């Protein structure tokens, strides 16, 4: 029979798109789906070939190629909400290539996605990546410090943070992952015992002294 | 056709019955009498079917609670051996009290042990709390975490916030729909 | 004083279930309190033992008139004797149960002088079945009876 | 700590074990001359002793000198503890 | 009809039937004399029953007091056993004179208990409460913890309100309609 | 009609039957000898009785007094376990008690106990007491608390008034009419 | 005529019978032999009945007394199980006493028991009385408080009039008319 | 045809199986009801089976837990043996605790076992805790080690955030095809 | 496999006792970097005992042999 019986009972939370060198993809969208399809396609009740791609692992896929045959690239994230003309987000501020050099990466990125049409390539400013990822660290009223340097950015939370102080960043942390992906900016959550929630001063002979972020943390009685 | 488990029990066989209907492979329990439960699948889901069982440490073992080592049986009773059995009942049934608030399906709750304080002139330690849960979902998990903080604070001797640490989420997705047949 | 009472009333039972008393109607009991007076000093001890007596002026100091709170002390002489029966209670129900079966023995053959066989054979049994139980049991209930700095005031009032 | 209960363990096991050869000898004739008398009836309870004073003097004989060389080994053992 | 469980009693049953006819899914409960009663579900409808059974650990475990770890058959009972006898009947008796106010359906309350004091001649601590109800709904359960607070405070030797803590919620939506039948 | 419970006594099953009388369902008491009751109730009436047996928590539970932890028939008594008891009968003699007032249905009343306050040197702590009711309706309900408080102030020693805490309230509304058999 | 009570008690029945017959339904007293008296009322009546047996509490438990725990029988007494008899057969004979005087239809009598007092540093505290009344109708029972209060100061051995609280009523009305068969 | 392990059980046939079907060679089971289980492969693939059994040292042996060196049934049990049995139930109870987290497949937690410091007047130590854990994949691992560490915290009496180890690792790729038969 | 230092003396006298020392063996499956793999047992053992140095744990571990499939062959006489 055809491909999109033998799967499950709805035929909602899957995706069979025609490839161009004669196989077909089944569009999963997360694990526990992408187990469900391939459990199908490996016991063999299918007389043809296929395949069961995903949004994370074939964004991980050619991202392999793209550090062989384009290195020192300043790139984000792949979007796969139409799977039939991706949304390649690239840097602006940090790429030389013109208008004939963008259109052989349009081209050569079509290439190895044989069941895509054409790849829409879109440049994002670097200066409103990290905005958001501040403006919504700060949202959330969590302590933290930011560490500007040349090719990304770094939070750092530290501290002995509280239960919700957990939750409230483990959330926002992976839905702000989602949207961007870990380039250009990382967050750093980790902990140890402070109640200075990362920052520490040092005291004398005028007031207090903001001193720099530094790896040495003092232990504190409490 | 071929079997994988058999000699289990029931509570054991609906959880192995749950774990691979999940992924895609359908089994079947057959009951055996005195013998208990038997579950078997068809021949190209063995391959894979051997595979979760391994990965899911499949069957399960019996849970364990800290009153079951300090048996009431024994004409001595030690001091260690009663406070032991007296914890281990309340970490039992605030985990039941935990269950029978808005929207958890579960939950589980440990207590610091503390036995060999009394026994010297040292004085007795702070008592410590830990809480798992698990929401259904739609629930603003963020603001239920004080609810629980509320509740363990002043069921125990003193305690402070600091000392109680909850850590919940939410469930997976709904499995409703069935597997299917391996034709060949 | 108290856990070494209790040491002594056990050595006092052991003693005399064994024989070796009723000449009077001790040999061993000085050797339990020997032996409890060197495993309570050598852990704390004269620490706790001091820590009583200086915390006996911080709420009975002179010339405030202390006195010895008489309705706890009508049952001291109780609490020793339960401790030591609890600790001795082994010992004495085998020594009772190899007196019923000898006097079982005697009622198949009365011609047997079953009083004096079974005077030989208890003091190797009150010595057997103390061996089993002397390491692991007998060192903690020395520094379980002791008597701590934070009970002065369930045992000393003051008039004033 | 773990001498101090090691010293106990011994002086109650050697309590034990020395005083065992001489309550095990006195102990079958003094079961054998009651066997003897259920076979041939007496009624002299005072009987046993005879032979109980030649059994306990005479194992205290052959072992007269093994004593000292238990004694011996284990009192200079627990003084080497005491003072080193 | 495949068999999800067998074996369960009578109390046991009406909860696992309570569970699963909430989700549009129907069983029967099958009487078998000694053996006890015996649960059966549809086959579209086995994916989904035994999906339920393993979230809500169904079928529920007999619930746990403290009086049950220290029984009153024993020879000899220490004060460490009499008092945790006694407050265990105390607290049983407080969740039972709960549900006779108005609107209550169900209530469970926790005492804390003392375990060093029953060995040393040290002063007890303050005693610590804690309380949880289902109320029925269109009530005002706003108003309704400064009466449990009330009724909560002056049973016992000396608490404050700090030490009391209640945390009450209004019951979950009525099931009054038939799941329905499986038709293919 | 499929059966809800069965093996029910004579006080358990006229509290099934008025509980589900109230949500107008039918239901049968179905005797059976010594093998208690039974109660049966129809097939559209059967998925509202198993939510209301489920949220009433239905069988009811034997109430617990604090008399049956400590029974008189042991060999030695504590005098611990000698006040319980007689805490335990003035308790339940002050709740008979306050049913022969001018209004009352039911009442409970608790007692403050104390038992670890008498083989010390301190002194006795202040005794409690914590009182229930329910009035029949037309009753001027804020005026009788001053009465029970009056009657309650001198049944012990030495109470305060304001150590008595009363939480009464009226009764439900009249279920006087049929439930009615369902037409098909 | 559904049944609604078996196995009661003589006195057990003449409470059902005339709790029933104020709220308009009949009943009968059944005989059944060596079981007891069983009433069964009419099926109109039957959820009026179901509900004021539910609502009313009957059937009545027996009436405690606090020298029925403390039973004459055993070889050794406390005199903590000596004062406890004493006093309850105290209030008993003072219970018979008040029933004697002029308009007096029932009367119960409290006193302040003494446990601590025994063995503790402390004297013995004074002794507080509580006492219930029901009047004939007619009687001006402001004026009776006087003579009960008199009459209850020097059975003792030193109370004030401030220890002593007489909560008294005048009788319902009376019930004289049969409540009438149901047409039908 | 040739049989290389026999007279196993059911968890050691399944992870026999489960290490050869992952290197391409196929297995056989065979019951033999009372003598246990056989495992047999093919003649080419014999040469290699016996290369994986010497490398992954199968059969596996039973797995060791420190309450198995200090049974419950001995007559006497010192304090070091009452220790070692109750730390032993809570490390396998944090165990049983962390497989309900939101991945987590399997866990092993470690604790640091005490025996010197109880005897002697010197205080007690710090305590350790070391976990392990298999997530299942495509989480970001790193942010999952907090959680942990915040859960293990506070059911312990006094430890800190550095004495605290986690090591957690996503679990392999899938195997879900056959191997497939050797054709000569 | 794991070795522990057995020492078991040390309550005998008034001294304080000992540290505690470990030492691990391991045999890794060919391919992986096995130099950054021993900071990971080595700090699964750190914190499961009192108090260990990070110079009191030895971790000596090896790549497996090549995996031998082939028939060995009959012989002719």
Same mark, same amino acid.
């Given at each position: 029979?055809?491909?999109?019986?033998?799967?499950?009972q709805?035929?909602?939370?899957?995706?069979?798109?025609?490839?161009?060198?004669?196989?077909?993809?089944?569009?999963a969208?997360?694990?526990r789906?992408t187990?469900?399809a391939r459990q199908?396609?490996?016991r063999?009740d299918?007389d043809?070939?296929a395949?069961v791609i995903?949004?994370?692992?074939?964004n991980?896929?050619?991202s $392999?190629?793209?550090?062989?045959?384009?290195?020192?690239?300043?790139?984000?994230?792949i979007?796969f909400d139409?799977?039939?003309?991706?949304?390649?987000?690239?840097?602006?501020?940090?790429?030389?290539?013109?208008?004939k050099?963008?259109?052989?990466?349009?081209?050569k990125?079509?290439?190895?996605?044989?069941?895509?049409?054409?790849?829409? $390539?879109?440049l994002? #400013?670097?200066?409103?990546?990290?905005?958001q990822?501040?403006?919504?660290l700060?949202?959330?009223?969590?302590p933290?410090?930011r560490?500007?340097?040349?090719?990304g950015?770094?939070?750092?939370?530290?501290?002995?943070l509280? #239960?919700?102080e957990?939750?409230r960043?483990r959330?926002f942390? #992976?839905?702000?992952?989602?949207?961007?992906?870990?380039?250009?900016?990382?967050?750093? $959550?980790?902990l140890?015992?402070?109640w200075?929630?990362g920052?520490?001063?040092?005291?004398?002979?005028?007031?207090? $002294?903001?001193?720099?972020?530094g790896?040495?943390y003092?232990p504190?009685?409490? | 056709?071929?079997?994988?488990?058999?000699?289990?029990?029931?509570?054991?066989?609906?959880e192995v019955?749950?774990?691979?209907?999940?992924?895609?492979?359908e089994?079947?329990?057959?009951?055996?009498?005195?013998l208990?439960y038997?579950?078997t699948?068809?021949? !190209?889901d063995?391959?894979?079917a051997?595979?979760?069982?391994?990965?899911?440490?499949? !069957?399960?073992?019996?849970?364990?609670?800290?009153?079951?080592?300090?048996?009431?049986d024994?004409?001595?009773?030690?001091?260690?051996?009663e406070?032991?059995?007296?914890?281990?009942?309340?970490?039992?049934? %605030?985990?039941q009290?935990?269950?029978?608030?808005?929207?958890?399906?579960?939950?589980?709750?440990?207590?610091?042990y503390?036995?060999?304080?009394?026994? /010297?002139?040292?004085?007795?330690?702070?008592v410590?709390?830990?809480?798992?849960?698990?929401?259904?979902?739609?629930? !603003? %998990?963020?603001?239920?975490?004080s609810?629980i903080?509320?509740f363990?604070?002043?069921?125990?001797?003193?305690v402070?916030?600091? /000392?109680?640490?909850?850590? %919940?989420?939410?469930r997976s997705?709904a499995? %409703?729909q069935? !597997?299917?047949?391996?034709?060949? | 004083?108290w856990?070494?009472?209790?040491m002594?009333?056990l050595?006092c039972?052991?003693?005399?279930? +064994? &024989?070796?008393?009723?000449?009077?109607?001790?040999?061993?009991?000085?050797?339990?309190?020997?032996?409890?007076?060197?495993?309570?000093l050598?852990? &704390?001890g004269?620490?706790?033992?001091?820590?009583?007596?200086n915390?006996?002026?911080?709420?009975?100091?002179?010339?405030?008139?202390?006195?010895?709170?008489?309705?706890?002390?009508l049952?001291?002489?109780?609490?020793?004797?339960q401790?030591?029966?609890?600790?001795?209670?082994?010992?004495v129900?085998?020594?009772?149960?190899?007196?019923?079966?000898?006097?079982?023995?005697?009622?198949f053959?009365?011609?047997m002088?079953?009083?004096?066989?079974s005077?030989?054979?208890?003091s190797?049994?009150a010595?057997?079945?103390?061996?089993?139980?002397?390491?692991?049991?007998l060192?903690?209930?020395?520094? +379980?009876?002791?008597?701590?700095?934070? &009970?002065?005031?369930?045992?000393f009032?003051?008039? &004033? | 700590m773990?001498?101090?209960?090691?010293?106990?363990?011994?002086?109650?096991?050697?309590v034990?074990?020395?005083?065992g050869?001489?309550?095990?000898?006195?102990?079958i004739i003094?079961?054998?001359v009651g066997?003897?008398?259920?076979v041939?009836?007496?009624?002299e309870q005072?009987?046993?002793?005879?032979?109980?004073?030649?059994?306990?003097?005479l194992?205290?004989?052959?072992?007269?000198?093994?004593?000292?060389?238990?004694?011996?080994?284990?009192?200079?053992?627990?003084?080497?503890?005491?003072?080193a």
């Amino acid at each position: 029979a055809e491909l999109d019986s033998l799967l499950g009972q709805e035929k909602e939370r899957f995706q069979v798109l025609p490839g161009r060198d004669k196989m077909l993809y089944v569009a999963a969208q997360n694990e526990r789906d992408t187990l469900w399809a391939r459990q199908v396609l490996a016991r063999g009740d299918y007389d043809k070939n296929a395949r069961v791609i995903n949004e994370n692992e074939e964004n991980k896929r050619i991202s $392999i190629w793209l550090d062989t045959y384009y290195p020192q690239l300043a790139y984000y994230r792949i979007h796969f909400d139409e799977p039939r003309k991706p949304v390649f987000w690239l840097s602006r501020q940090r790429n030389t290539m013109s208008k004939k050099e963008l259109e052989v990466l349009s081209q050569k990125l079509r290439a190895l996605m044989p069941y895509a049409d054409s790849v829409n $390539i879109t440049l994002m #400013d670097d200066v409103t990546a990290a905005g958001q990822a501040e403006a919504g660290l700060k949202q959330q009223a969590l302590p933290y410090s930011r560490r500007n340097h040349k090719g990304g950015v770094t939070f750092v939370i530290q501290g002995a943070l509280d #239960d919700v102080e957990i939750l409230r960043a483990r959330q926002f942390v #992976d839905s702000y992952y989602r949207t961007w992906g870990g380039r250009y900016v990382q967050f750093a $959550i980790e902990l140890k015992d402070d109640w200075l929630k990362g920052r520490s001063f040092q005291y004398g002979a005028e007031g207090y $002294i903001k001193m720099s972020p530094g790896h040495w943390y003092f232990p504190s009685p409490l | 056709d071929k079997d994988l488990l058999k000699g289990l029990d029931q509570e054991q066989a609906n959880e192995v019955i749950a774990v691979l209907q999940m992924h895609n492979i359908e089994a079947n329990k057959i009951d055996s009498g005195k013998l208990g439960y038997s579950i078997t699948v068809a021949e !190209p889901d063995f391959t894979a079917a051997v595979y979760w069982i391994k990965t899911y440490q499949l !069957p399960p073992r019996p849970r364990v609670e800290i009153a079951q080592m300090f048996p009431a049986d024994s004409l001595v009773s030690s001091p260690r051996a009663e406070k032991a059995r007296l914890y281990s009942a309340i970490e039992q049934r %605030l985990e039941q009290s935990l269950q029978t608030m808005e929207g958890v399906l579960s939950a589980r709750v440990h207590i610091s042990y503390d036995i060999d304080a009394g026994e /010297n002139g040292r004085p007795p330690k702070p008592v410590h709390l830990s809480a798992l849960a698990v929401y259904e979902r739609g629930s !603003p %998990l963020a603001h239920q975490i004080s609810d629980i903080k509320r509740f363990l604070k002043n069921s125990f001797a003193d305690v402070d916030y600091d /000392n109680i640490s909850v850590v %919940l989420s939410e469930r997976s997705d709904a499995q %409703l729909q069935a !597997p299917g047949t391996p034709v060949k | 004083s108290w856990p070494f009472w209790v040491m002594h009333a056990l050595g006092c039972i052991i003693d005399n279930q +064994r &024989g070796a008393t009723l000449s009077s109607s001790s040999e061993m009991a000085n050797f339990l309190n020997m032996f409890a007076a060197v495993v309570y000093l050598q852990n &704390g001890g004269l620490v706790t033992m001091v820590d009583v007596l200086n915390k006996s002026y911080q709420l009975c100091d002179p010339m405030n008139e202390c006195t010895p709170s008489l309705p706890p002390l009508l049952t001291f002489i109780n609490q020793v004797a339960q401790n030591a029966l609890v600790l001795a209670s082994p010992v004495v129900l085998v020594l009772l149960l190899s007196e019923v079966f000898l006097g079982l023995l005697s009622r198949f053959a009365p011609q047997m002088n079953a009083f004096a066989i079974s005077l030989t054979v208890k003091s190797g049994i009150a010595v057997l079945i103390m061996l089993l139980y002397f390491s692991p049991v007998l060192p903690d209930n020395v520094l +379980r009876l002791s008597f701590q700095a934070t &009970g002065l005031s369930s045992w000393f009032y003051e008039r &004033g | 700590m773990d001498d101090l209960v090691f010293a106990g363990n011994k002086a109650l096991y050697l309590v034990l074990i020395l005083s065992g050869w001489p309550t095990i000898v006195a102990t079958i004739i003094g079961l054998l001359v009651g066997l003897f008398q259920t076979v041939t009836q007496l009624q002299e309870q005072t009987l046993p002793f005879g032979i109980k004073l030649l059994g306990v003097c005479l194992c205290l004989f052959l072992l007269s000198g093994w004593y000292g060389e238990v004694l011996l080994s284990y009192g200079r053992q627990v003084i080497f503890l005491a003072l080193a």
